[PDB]
Every structure is written in structure tokens, then in C-alpha cells.
Amino acid sequence: MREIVHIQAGQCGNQIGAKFWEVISDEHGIDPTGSYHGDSDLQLERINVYYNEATGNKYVPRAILVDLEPGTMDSVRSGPFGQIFRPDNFVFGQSGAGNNWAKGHYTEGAELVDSVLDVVRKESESCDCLQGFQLTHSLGGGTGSGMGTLLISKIREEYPDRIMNTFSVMPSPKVSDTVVEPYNATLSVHQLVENTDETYCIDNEALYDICFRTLKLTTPTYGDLNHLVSATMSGVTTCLRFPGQLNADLRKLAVNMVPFPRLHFFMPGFAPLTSRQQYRALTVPELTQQMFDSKNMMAACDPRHGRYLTVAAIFRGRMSMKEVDEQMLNVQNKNSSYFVEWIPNNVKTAVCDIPPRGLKMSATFIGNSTAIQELFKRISEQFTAMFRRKAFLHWYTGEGMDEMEFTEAESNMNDLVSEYQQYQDA
Amino acid sequence: MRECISIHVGQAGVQIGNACWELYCLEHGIQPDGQMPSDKTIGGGDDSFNTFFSETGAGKHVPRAVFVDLEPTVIDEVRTGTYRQLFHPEQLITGKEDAANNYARGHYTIGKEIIDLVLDRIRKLADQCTGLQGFLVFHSFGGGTGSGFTSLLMERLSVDYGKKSKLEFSIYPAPQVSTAVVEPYNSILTTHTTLEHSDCAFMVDNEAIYDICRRNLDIERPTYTNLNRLISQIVSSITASLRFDGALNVDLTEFQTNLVPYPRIHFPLATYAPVISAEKAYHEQLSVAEITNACFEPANQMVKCDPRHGKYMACCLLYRGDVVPKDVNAAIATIKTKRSIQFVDWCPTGFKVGINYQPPTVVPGGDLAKVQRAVCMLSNTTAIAEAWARLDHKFDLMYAKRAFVHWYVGEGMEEGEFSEAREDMAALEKDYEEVGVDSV
Ligand SMILES: C=C/C=C\[C@H](C)[C@H](OC(N)=O)[C@@H](C)[C@H](O)[C@@H](C)C/C(C)=C\[C@H](C)[C@@H](O)[C@@H](C)/C=C\[C@@H](O)C[C@@H]1OC(=O)[C@H](C)[C@@H](O)[C@H]1C
Ligand SMILES: Nc1nc2c(ncn2[C@@H]2O[C@H](COP(=O)(O)OP(=O)(O)OP(=O)(O)O)[C@@H](O)[C@H]2O)c(=O)[nH]1
Ligand SMILES: Nc1nc2c(ncn2[C@@H]2O[C@H](COP(=O)(O)OP(=O)(O)O)[C@@H](O)[C@H]2O)c(=O)[nH]1
Ligand SMILES: [Ca+2]
Ligand SMILES: [Ca+2]
Ligand SMILES: [Mg+2]
Ligand SMILES: [Mg+2]
């Protein structure tokens, strides 16, 4: 049993995390009360990766829910699968973090973090063989961003030999709550550069544009964005949750995907993306082409603007593996220039027989592309436009931060951008 | 949790307080005796309206509010009027002798005799909160109590509650309803003294409100009652996020993050729509597009100034009633392609939107039509410094001859405090110039 411990923090983190557990619970045949009602042994074979077994053959998510205000976790608890979570794994304060990284990381978050670590330890202690951790959060707010990265640092201190994986929602001016999001995101990215092994970068503008342009949703909601993210998270974790050879655990995945320690930020993608023709059969060739289509990717970065260091592709459903191999080989052989030539055979493909609910087949894309630098450049530009005038800084210096820490975060992310550029030219 | 305590100071603060609390009661279904049939939790709760109302075991919903005035006759009308049962007598605090339109008497001579009592009463409200968020302070610029006692109170609150948030609703003077020649002195003194102690201040220009009543409601000669009902609708729009829940509801503190780029630049411009009479509203539904467009009409601003001649550092739209994002987004798009909306270069240009679904309410015997939807825009614009400029100039005219200054010196003040206050205002005006200049 290679247990993963899941953590979800702040508003974004808990809303997406709740949807994620809804989605994979349905895949494993777990109902809202933790009872199993599936019809396939494939569903239970690796169920212990994400679920603990309670008395009465109940399955309980190995999940810790964290926030600095009670509202979103109240909603989670009142939601569809809200009763499936362990009540003691709800850890929350009352004062909130005010969309402020400093409040999350240094003041409000600091008061709460030990109680979170106590629950993390309790979950880790019962693991037969802990793989590591996966955190869901946004980078643009205060709790997920500031307290989330505080958590990651303390977890690394207590579990230095375990893998740390995040699903990190990057802010965009187009789908924005506050003007200080670029401050919060820049502060957090430096934390992630040092303390995660794998980070899936989800850009809210990409999510919005997929909903509006491709799915024809006239007025996308956070709820719509979150179902996209949930479907993607289900796809990217398929290899962890079902029998398989490739990327079957967090460490083997990292060894395959991360050739240089700092360059561990992935662009995920999902297919099919279909507007409400929705009954039309999908072919492997069509899955493959859409999976690699920039329009199906979620970092708002143009892959043709860079090069792939490594790629993992996961196909789900009953389909010809012969055709999958053929189609995957075709994509690499016909656009070979976008794959760095100094990492031979850097595209790995996995197939899982169980498709997502309500689909005959689907495909999920994980790319380690140097084009991700565009995302960090955007954040850096927005950061500097304000910081050059020290605008909105008083929210942070009021929590004890000084300007030098912002200067260092800025330099750190520009270093990261430079590091991507050198391998794009290599 | 998240309690807010309101403090109403002097005649303007108290009478505006009357109008707001009456309106809140109507919005939440609270009777004048404080009973609220719809509230099924007796004697407590953590509902949204509990941010502004505590509850007794006898089912009374009591404003989290203190009324303070240095003479008794305005607050006596609260003590003896329609909503008298609403307030515990200890929440209504009066002295015998007012500040005679003199900041020095409000802050020093008369104010010092009652400030400890007022703080004790506030502490009693604070002690009943489980997560006090901060204070909302209502007062005029021009009166002796509104200016001088408010300053003293804000200073003492900083000491006793530290950096707990303090927001103001400040009544900026207009000649049509002003009662003292020295109101510009009082305004500059209190603005200087309170500046470091306030996190955010919503100025309400009596002349702007006076004009709106005359023009939009066809009121020949607006009374304070007319002015105050309008002001309470605007105050209610601003506090609605605190008092109601909802999926699309955005907390005031979240708008505040965007509205205050530097501590001293903390004076948002409020614009409210629709202000329309019953006779004009009948059979004439005003859409989301129409009320949104009206926010960029200067005639509808709470402070007279011209944003078309300034730069924006933030734009927030607070909707209430029958409003969905689809319609808001379309309305904003139209506006961006037709309006004088220029932002400074160091600020993002997106409009921040909040929607509260509870529809607007009106008071019986009022001038405003009951509408299905309304909006309050809160913008941070360099144009608001026009208001300071006008006041600072009246100050300069009188102070050059030291007119009326002996009234202040006689109560213990020094000329040094006047020039210090006026220099702070000059620096503020300069701060507003500087934030508008492009980055190099
Ligand atoms: C908006 C499109 C909705 C449905 C489409 C017709 C498609 O459905 C089928 N059956 O082909 C799906 C796969 C879309 O292509 C997806 C982009 C929809 C998607 C994930 C998110 C939307 C943004 C969001 O509004 C959401 C509430 C709408 C529909 C979801 O209930 C669809 C199901 O969600 C899943 O998690 C599984 C993958 C699978 O069971 C899927 C059928
Ligand atoms: N909008 C509004 N303005 C008012 C009201 N009452 C007074 N004002 C304005 O407030 C200023 C005068 O200050 P007041 O609040 O009356 O004075 P005070 O705070 O009671 O101070 P003293 O009487 O000097 O102790 C003038 O600009 C008036 O026009 C009111 O009910 N509504
Ligand atoms: N995709 C998605 N993004 C969200 C959601 N809620 C907030 N955000 C984004 O997250 C950032 C705000 O952080 P949030 O999680 O609300 O703050 P926190 O509660 O302090 O962590 C902004 O970039 C928002 O656009 C959500 O439910 N889904
Ligand atoms: Ca604390
Ligand atoms: Ca109650
Ligand atoms: Mg939020
Ligand atoms: Mg008076």
C-alpha cells in the first residue's frame, strides 16, 4: 500500500478538492457515505492509495481540509459528498487571510499550522508506506497561497524523504478577485520552486477560455472551471489509482518527468472537450490530436513557443493499444522539433481500461514544456507594474514583511524564466 | 464572528444613524420593538445580519451601535421616537453642552469630559463580539462634535483596539445646508487628526446629495430627512455584503484591498443608481445596463468632482437585487468602449464586481421609488482630491487673516495646529497628484 496524503487549502483549494473527491469516488464506486457499490475489482485494487478503510468496510478519503475562515468548508460539509470526509480532518480558523500571502504565511496561518500538522501526522502514522503528499490550492489568494506554501515547507522539514505534489491554480487578470494576486503568486512560486517535486500549473484564464470558446459556455462560473480541473486531476492521477506499469507512483513519475530539479512545473490537458454531437463516438486519432492541441491545455501557454522536455500521456477506456501506440508515435514523428532531442524517448504513454463516468474514452496530457516560462513572465510583468510604484505593499508590510523579500521573490522568478530559456535553446 | 460596531457622532452622525438603522430593520424584517419573526434562533446566532445586530434571550435584535452627542436634543428624539425600544438606553450617550461649531471644544474642552464614558460603552459592545472586525464611524466634517470629538475618539480607538479596522462615513459641508462659517477649519483639523487612524473613509458631499434630491427626485428644497434617506441607501449598499450572504456576494474588505493602494489614499468615490421618483419609475423598468451607465455620470456621484479629468486606480461595482453576471458583463463591455475611463499605468483595469441578491428596500413616506435592482460604484480616482482643494482654499482665505482663530486659541489650541493640519492637507493633495503620474 503506497498511501498518498491529500491536503486542500483555502477557498479555491477546497472547492476544487471537493469536486475532485466527488469525481474519483464515483470512479472507485464509493458512495457519499463511504460505502462501496462498484462492480469491478479494478476499483478496489489500489483504493488504499487515496482512501483509508474504516469499520464496516467504509472507505474514508485520506484528506485534510484547511482554511483560515469556516465558510467554504461549511459548504463542503453541506455539499454532495461532504459527509464522506473524516470530521477531525477539517482544520480551520475564523479570521480569514484577506487575500494576503503574508497573513497566510506569517501571521494568521502561523497560528493555525501546527494543528494542521497534527492531523497530517495522524494520517501519515497509519500509512504502511507513505508516498508523499498532494496539495490543491490557488496561488492568488492568501490561505491556499501563503498558508499552503507554509504547510509545504513544514511538511518537507518533517518528511524530507517524501514526494510533494501540488495542483496550483495560477491567477489571471481576466478571472481575478483582487489586484494583489500577482504579489501572492510571485511569493508562492519561489516556495514551489524549492519545495515541490511536481506542480501542475492550472491557469484560470485557460480554463475560462476553454469554457467560453470550446465548450460554448456563455458565462462560465467558478463551478464550471472546477469541473474542468476535477476531470483533469482525475486523469492525471489515473496511473496512481489503478493497476499499471508507467508512472505508477509519485517518485517514479518525478524521475521520468523532471530532468532538472527546479523545472518541475507541468502543463496538463484533457480530451475530449465537447460542447452540448456530444454522443458522437471519439476515435483514438481524434483523442490524440485534441490532447496535444494547445486549446485543450490549461496553462495558457503556447507549446509551439517552446520545447517538451518530457511528456506523459494517459488514455482511458476500451481502445486499441496498437492504435494508441501508432497515434502517439505519429505525433512525435510529425512534430519532432518540439521535443528536445537530447532526452531520447521522452514521451511515455499509459493506458487504463476504466474511462471517466459517462465517456467511452478520454485522454489526459502532462507536459514538461519550456513554454511554461510564458506563464511566469506574465506574472512577473504584472508584479513589476505594481512593485515599481510599491502599490498595495502596505497590506504586506503591515504583517511584518519588508520590501527586500518582494525584491528577492521577483529575482527568483526571473531566474526561473531564464533557466527555461536556456534549455529551449539547448 | 465578524461583528461590526457602528458609532454615530454629533447631529449629522446621529440623524444619518437614525435613517440607516431604520432601513436595516426594514431590510431584515426587524420590527421597531426589535422582534424578528423570521429568526428561529433565539438569543443568539451567527447569521449574516448578526454582524450588525446582537440578540437578547427575549428575542430582541439590538443594533451594535453607540450614538454620541455633546448636547441631548437630537439623541432625545431617538430616546422618545419610533425605534426607541430598539436601543438599550446605555447605547445612547449625551452631554449637556455642545461644541458650538468649534473643533477645539469637541476634541478638548467638552469632549474630554465624556470620552472615557463613551469608550466604556463601546467596550461593552466589543465584549459581546466573538470576532470583532472593526468600527464604522458616522460624523460631519463641519460640526464641533462631528469634527473634534470624532478625532479624539478615533485616536483613543487606535490605542484601545490597535489596528482593528476603522471606516468612516464623513459628511462634507455644503453652503445650502451649512450652519457655521468655520466649517472649513473644522474639516481640515479633523481630516488631519484622523488621517492616520482611519483605514477607509467614504466622503458624502452634502451639495452632491442636495443636487441629486433636487434634480432626480424633484424636491424643491431638500431637508436633512430627504438627504439622509438617500445617504442611507448608499450606506446600505456598502454594508450589504456584511449583512447578507450569497454565492456572488463579495465582502467589503475584499473591495477594500483593491481600493487602498497606499495608507493615505483611502477615500473612495461612491456613485449610486437609480435615484428616481415613484412617478418616474412607474411602468419604467431600469435595466442592469441603464443603472450601470448611470454610475459613470458625475451627476450621480456622492462627491462633486470630475473623474473624467482624473485617473482611476480602482473601480468596484456593488449590485443588489435582480442582477446576474451575464447582464453585468455585457453592461461593462459597452461602457469600456464608450467612456472616459483612464487608469494609472501601475494598476490593472478590470472592474471588480459583487452581487447581493436581496433587493433594495425603501422607507414608507420616502422619495425614492422601490426598484428591482440597484448599484453602488466605489472608485478610487485622483479626482476626489478636488474636494480637498475646494476646502483647503476656503481655509486659506480665512486663515490668512486669522479670522475666527481666537475661538480655537481661547479653548487651548495653538496656531501651530492649524498650519500643521493645513500642511498635511497640502501633502495629501500632492500625494494625489503623484499617484496619477505615469511610471518612468
Ligand atoms: C459542457 C460540456 C458538458 C458535457 C460534454 C457534452 C462532455 O460530455 C460528454 N458526455 O461527452 C464533457 C466530457 C465535456 O467535454 C467536459 C469539458 C465537461 C466538463 C468536465 C466540465 C464542464 C466545464 C462543466 O460545466 C460540467 C459541469 C459539465 C459536465 C460534466 O458533468 C461532464 C462530465 O464530467 C466529468 O467529470 C467526467 C469527465 C464525465 O463524466 C463528463 C461526462
Ligand atoms: N446629511 C446631513 N448633514 C447634516 C445633518 N445634520 C447636520 N449636517 C451637516 O453637519 C454640519 C454641522 O455639524 P453637526 O453634525 O450639526 O454638528 P455636531 O457634530 O452636532 O457639532 P456641535 O453641534 O458643534 O457640537 C453641517 O455641514 C450640516 O449641514 C444631517 O442630518 N444630515
Ligand atoms: N478555478 C478556481 N479558481 C478560484 C476559485 N476560487 C478562487 N479562485 C481563484 O483563486 C484566487 C483567489 O484565492 P482564494 O483561494 O479565493 O483565496 P484563499 O481562500 O485565501 O486561498 C484567484 O486567482 C481566483 O481567481 C475556484 O473555485 N476555482
Ligand atoms: Ca490571531
Ligand atoms: Ca438568531
Ligand atoms: Mg476567495
Ligand atoms: Mg450638535
Side-chain angles (χ1 to χ4, degrees):
Chain A
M1 318 178 188
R2 292 275 282 156
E3 298 86 344
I4 294 176
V5 172
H6 163 94
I7 304 164
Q8 52 189 60
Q11 174 165 44
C12 182
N14 279 281
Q15 293 177 166
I16 291 182
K19 292 304 293 192
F20 169 73
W21 283 102
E22 174 169 9
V23 172
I24 70 165
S25 291
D26 173 70
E27 295 188 5
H28 286 286
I30 308 304
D31 67 15
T33 58
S35 290
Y36 172 83
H37 287 288
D39 65 333
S40 172
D41 289 338
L42 293 67
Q43 289 176 309
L44 293 184
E45 189 132 0
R46 305 186 76 196
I47 196 63
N48 269 121
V49 172
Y50 278 88
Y51 298 81
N52 292 315
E53 263 194 66
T55 312
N57 199 28
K58 293 278 185 176
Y59 298 91
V60 184
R62 196 171 301 102
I64 304 170
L65 300 75
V66 181
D67 212 336
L68 282 166
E69 60 192 13
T72 302
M73 281 165 49
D74 286 348
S75 291
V76 163
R77 193 179 304 121
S78 289
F81 275 75
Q83 305 298 332
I84 205 191
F85 301 108
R86 195 188 203 277
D88 282 343
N89 286 23
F90 288 80
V91 190
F92 56 96
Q94 298 287 328
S95 288
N99 289 289
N100 188 315
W101 193 88
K103 282 181 176 174
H105 203 85
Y106 291 122
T107 55
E108 306 297 331
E111 183 169 356
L112 187 63
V113 68
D114 284 349
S115 60
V116 175
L117 291 174
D118 290 337
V119 173
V120 169
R121 194 175 301 99
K122 181 279 167 183
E123 291 291 356
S124 296
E125 281 180 351
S126 52
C127 293
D128 168 51
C129 189
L130 175 66
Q131 302 197 36
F133 308 87
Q134 68 165 41
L135 164 77
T136 59
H137 65 153
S138 70
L139 302 196
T143 299
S145 191
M147 196 189 181
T149 54
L150 178 66
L151 273 170
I152 286 168
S153 189
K154 293 194 184 305
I155 287 173
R156 184 170 196 194
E157 184 168 27
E158 182 166 2
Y159 308 84
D161 58 343
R162 297 300 100 193
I163 298 290
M164 174 60 72
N165 174 309
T166 74
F167 293 86
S168 303
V169 179
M170 321 285 173
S172 159
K174 315 308 200 59
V175 186
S176 171
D177 295 338
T178 70
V179 295
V180 299
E181 282 164 3
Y183 283 156
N184 298 325
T186 296
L187 288 167
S188 278
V189 168
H190 174 59
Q191 300 297 312
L192 304 177
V193 166
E194 309 295 342
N195 294 325
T196 72
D197 294 290
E198 311 134 338
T199 289
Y200 301 96
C201 299
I202 305 149
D203 182 290
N204 258 1
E205 182 170 18
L207 299 181
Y208 191 97
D209 289 335
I210 288 166
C211 289
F212 184 86
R213 296 175 190 166
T214 303
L215 303 185
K216 305 309 180 190
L217 302 179
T218 303
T219 307
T221 65
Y222 273 132
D224 293 322
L225 273 39
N226 294 346
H227 220 108
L228 259 180
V229 177
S230 294
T232 300
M233 295 181 66
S234 166
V236 309
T237 63
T238 289
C239 285
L240 304 172
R241 295 188 288 112
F242 298 99
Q245 280 281 324
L246 170 70
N247 299 323
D249 70 74
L250 296 178
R251 187 173 300 282
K252 277 191 182 187
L253 170 60
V255 170
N256 281 346
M257 290 295 290
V258 185
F260 310 98
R262 286 159 46 93
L263 313 187
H264 57 254
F265 299 85
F266 306 151
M267 311 187 344
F270 180 87
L273 298 168
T274 311
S275 48
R276 283 190 166 99
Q277 298 292 343
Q278 64 185 96
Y279 310 113
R280 178 195 189 188
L282 260 146
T283 59
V284 166
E286 292 174 348
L287 267 184
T288 308
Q289 173 150 13
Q290 293 164 203
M291 189 185 34
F292 273 100
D293 195 329
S294 54
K295 304 205 302 299
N296 289 61
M297 288 176 206
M298 286 160 186
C301 299
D302 191 349
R304 307 185 77 107
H305 286 189
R307 303 186 94 203
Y308 291 117
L309 302 175
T310 61
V311 174
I314 306 81
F315 291 76
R316 307 180 61 175
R318 302 187 69 239
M319 72 195 70
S320 168
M321 184 155 308
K322 173 175 157 59
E323 199 170 44
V324 166
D325 289 341
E326 291 181 356
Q327 291 302 305
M328 286 300 302
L329 290 178
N330 183 272
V331 174
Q332 304 165 74
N333 290 329
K334 286 187 65 64
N335 314 287
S336 63
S337 66
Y338 295 104
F339 301 86
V340 303
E341 66 283 4
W342 38 273
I343 305 179
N345 311 117
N346 64 342
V347 183
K348 301 298 171 192
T349 295
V351 184
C352 169
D353 297 287
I354 299 179
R357 176 66 85 131
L359 294 182
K360 293 288 181 69
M361 63 184 54
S362 68
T364 300
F365 167 88
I366 312 174
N368 190 351
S369 165
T370 64
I372 195 79
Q373 69 170 299
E374 295 187 324
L375 179 160
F376 299 123
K377 280 177 183 179
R378 294 193 295 263
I379 300 292
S380 196
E381 287 180 311
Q382 302 159 14
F383 177 99
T384 297
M386 294 185 296
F387 189 60
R388 64 173 171 189
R389 300 291 289 267
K390 304 180 176 185
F392 304 103
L393 266 195
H394 70 99
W395 296 128
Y396 299 80
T397 60
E399 301 302 306
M401 288 185 76
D402 51 31
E403 295 178 1
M404 185 56 55
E405 183 161 349
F406 284 72
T407 303
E408 290 162 357
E410 183 178 44
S411 300
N412 294 336
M413 202 163 68
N414 287 344
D415 283 345
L416 181 65
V417 169
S418 304
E419 190 177 354
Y420 281 110
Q421 184 58 43
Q422 68 176 95
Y423 292 114
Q424 181 174 305
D425 295 323
Chain B
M1 230 69 197
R2 298 298 178 86
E3 296 91 352
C4 298
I5 289 170
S6 298
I7 308 168
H8 306 275
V9 177
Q11 172 176 301
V14 167
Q15 294 188 155
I16 286 167
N18 290 338
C20 292
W21 286 103
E22 167 173 29
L23 183 58
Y24 295 160
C25 286
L26 292 177
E27 293 182 8
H28 299 292
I30 294 164
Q31 303 162 8
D33 68 347
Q35 294 291 317
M36 170 177 179
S38 67
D39 177 16
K40 305 311 183 183
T41 51
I42 322 304
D46 55 344
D47 289 306
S48 293
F49 60 82
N50 286 126
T51 56
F52 277 60
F53 295 86
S54 59
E55 304 179 34
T56 72
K60 182 181 286 189
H61 295 64
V62 177
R64 300 188 193 271
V66 173
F67 289 59
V68 186
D69 199 2
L70 294 187
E71 58 117 347
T73 63
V74 184
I75 284 179
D76 278 346
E77 291 297 291
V78 180
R79 297 182 165 131
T80 204
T82 298
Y83 284 86
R84 65 185 180 284
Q85 309 170 253
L86 208 61
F87 309 97
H88 187 284
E90 290 191 351
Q91 295 173 250
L92 315 173
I93 304 153
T94 55
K96 295 179 162 298
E97 185 181 7
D98 64 31
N101 285 324
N102 186 342
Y103 174 98
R105 288 173 59 86
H107 189 284
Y108 300 95
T109 310
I110 305 301
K112 74 182 167 58
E113 302 295 343
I114 205 163
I115 180 66
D116 289 321
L117 176 58
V118 168
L119 286 163
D120 290 348
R121 299 296 171 78
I122 295 175
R123 174 67 63 189
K124 279 180 161 58
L125 292 181
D127 286 339
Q128 305 170 39
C129 302
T130 54
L132 173 66
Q133 196 184 254
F135 302 94
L136 296 185
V137 181
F138 298 75
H139 70 104
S140 69
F141 275 171
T145 297
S147 62
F149 189 78
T150 302
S151 284
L152 174 67
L153 177 64
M154 297 282 282
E155 293 174 302
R156 293 288 292 268
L157 287 178
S158 286
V159 174
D160 286 8
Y161 294 90
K163 290 185 178 306
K164 185 127 307 174
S165 302
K166 300 196 288 303
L167 268 58
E168 307 167 76
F169 289 91
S170 301
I171 312 307
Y172 175 106
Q176 295 87 347
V177 292
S178 78
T179 39
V181 185
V182 293
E183 287 191 39
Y185 284 167
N186 291 340
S187 300
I188 271 56
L189 289 168
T190 189
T191 295
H192 162 58
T193 295
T194 295
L195 197 47
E196 292 185 11
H197 301 286
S198 176
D199 301 282
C200 185
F202 303 98
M203 286 194 291
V204 175
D205 181 351
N206 265 349
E207 190 162 6
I209 305 302
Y210 197 91
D211 285 348
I212 288 166
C213 289
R214 279 196 291 185
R215 178 204 320 118
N216 298 37
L217 298 176
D218 289 287
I219 304 171
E220 279 193 2
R221 207 294 188 182
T223 66
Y224 286 140
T225 295
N226 298 134
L227 301 186
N228 290 350
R229 299 226 161 108
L230 180 44
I231 292 161
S232 69
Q233 293 293 345
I234 295 157
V235 173
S236 170
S237 275
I238 287 155
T239 67
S241 58
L242 307 170
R243 296 178 292 108
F244 293 104
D245 208 43
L248 295 185
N249 178 61
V250 178
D251 205 83
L252 182 60
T253 59
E254 204 173 283
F255 292 112
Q256 285 181 261
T257 299
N258 280 22
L259 284 167
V260 187
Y262 308 92
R264 290 159 61 86
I265 308 302
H266 68 231
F267 297 93
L269 177 65
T271 310
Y272 180 85
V275 180
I276 182 180
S277 69
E279 285 95 339
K280 287 295 197 288
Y282 184 67
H283 284 175
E284 262 75 58
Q285 60 197 86
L286 293 171
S287 71
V288 174
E290 291 173 315
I291 67 170
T292 305
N293 292 335
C295 293
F296 292 87
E297 165 57 53
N300 302 323
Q301 298 162 187
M302 266 196 339
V303 177
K304 302 192 85 170
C305 67
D306 194 350
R308 296 172 290 198
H309 292 162
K311 294 192 190 176
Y312 283 89
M313 289 162 283
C315 195
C316 306
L317 293 161
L318 287 58
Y319 292 93
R320 67 191 308 181
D322 179 34
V323 178
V324 297
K326 174 178 102 313
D327 299 323
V328 173
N329 297 335
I332 289 175
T334 295
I335 279 163
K336 278 185 181 295
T337 71
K338 298 184 173 177
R339 285 285 195 170
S340 296
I341 307 164
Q342 179 83 48
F343 279 80
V344 298
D345 63 14
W346 49 264
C347 175
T349 62
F351 294 177
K352 185 178 167 54
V353 169
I355 303 165
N356 285 111
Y357 282 113
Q358 159 104 354
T361 311
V362 294
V363 175
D367 315 289
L368 285 169
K370 174 83 135 52
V371 297
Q372 289 199 96
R373 58 194 72 83
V375 62
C376 181
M377 185 168 85
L378 300 175
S379 56
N380 181 17
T381 164
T382 58
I384 196 134
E386 286 185 54
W388 304 129
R390 294 192 300 269
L391 222 44
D392 287 338
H393 177 59
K394 293 179 192 287
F395 183 106
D396 293 342
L397 287 168
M398 291 192 292
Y399 194 69
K401 315 281 185 287
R402 302 296 193 275
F404 305 99
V405 171
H406 67 107
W407 287 115
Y408 296 72
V409 170
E411 296 287 6
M413 288 186 66
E414 313 185 339
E415 285 189 328
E417 296 176 68
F418 281 74
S419 53
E420 168 188 318
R422 177 62 181 97
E423 296 168 3
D424 195 14
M425 293 307 303
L428 190 63
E429 285 198 48
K430 179 177 182 181
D431 292 337
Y432 273 98
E433 295 184 21
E434 287 176 3
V435 290
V437 183
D438 290 325
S439 308
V440 185

